[PDB]
Design a protein around this ligand. Sequence first.
Ligand SMILES: N[C@H](CO[AsH](O)(O)O)Cc1cnc[nH]1
Ligand SMILES: [Cl-]
Ligand SMILES: [Cl-]
Ligand SMILES: [Cl-]
Ligand SMILES: [Zn+2]
Ligand SMILES: [Zn+2]
Ligand SMILES: [Zn+2]
Ligand SMILES: [Zn+2]
Length: 263
Amino acid sequence: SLKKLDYHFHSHFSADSEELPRKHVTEAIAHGLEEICFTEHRDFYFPGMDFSLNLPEYFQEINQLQAEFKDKIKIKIGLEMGIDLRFKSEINQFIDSAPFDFVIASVHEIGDIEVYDGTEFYLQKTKEEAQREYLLACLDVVQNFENYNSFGHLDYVARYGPYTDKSIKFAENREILFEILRALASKEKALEINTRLFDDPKTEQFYSDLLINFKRLGGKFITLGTDSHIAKRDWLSIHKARTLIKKAGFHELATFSGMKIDK
Ligand SMILES: N[C@H](CO[AsH](O)(O)O)Cc1cnc[nH]1
Ligand SMILES: [Cl-]
Ligand SMILES: [Cl-]
Ligand SMILES: [Cl-]
Ligand SMILES: [Zn+2]
Ligand SMILES: [Zn+2]
Ligand SMILES: [Zn+2]
Ligand SMILES: [Zn+2]
């Protein structure tokens, strides 16, 4: 059975969350989670909004919670790092500046245009065009950046936009997704199963396809996260994800300490 965990969530330390870290912990304990990893935002020179992170304060707060809740739950201190290859050396300096336990690499903007509701990213672009541009940027990151553990939300582009049906289909992006999955596998990176959109059967179908093909292409490591910016979680969505992961033939989730896989 898979370790009960959440490896992607945000508290007031992130620019777009105002949640109490203690509340994530008490919610996690009430559900019976064995391990959690805070993954606060850092994105360099982000368009329209600063995603900065106060490392002294962040580490101090979580370090206190680790001590207080030591006997009840395992707590890790991680990072969701927005990647843009233009800032690779600055990004690497930041990641190397503190002893993060776990790092997610995510694409949140492309060419200083944010991928989000109401931005220029989706303007006069078909959903297929938007999906292709987003996945090409992800592939670029996987090919040229190595300082992370797991690749965040491949379906991110399907959260937003003006389309009636925002879903992403594996079949319509098969070649690029194969390239991404194989590159992750060969570099021994984890694939993140992100439960944000799991209320939608089409999201389940997409991740099921991701999982089965990752396995086919040599994938070993899977991380699981809610992406919750508040403490209240959608546990049904998490349970649905856990079922897919097991069904696809993964018998363990990957956990990390100081960015090294736990044995
Ligand atoms: N990147 C941000 C969204 O959070 As998550 O990547 O789902 O942890 C983008 C954003 C939030 N608020 C404005 N823009
Ligand atoms: Cl669970
Ligand atoms: Cl910055
Ligand atoms: Cl690198
Ligand atoms: Zn966020
Ligand atoms: Zn993200
Ligand atoms: Zn996130
Ligand atoms: Zn559960």
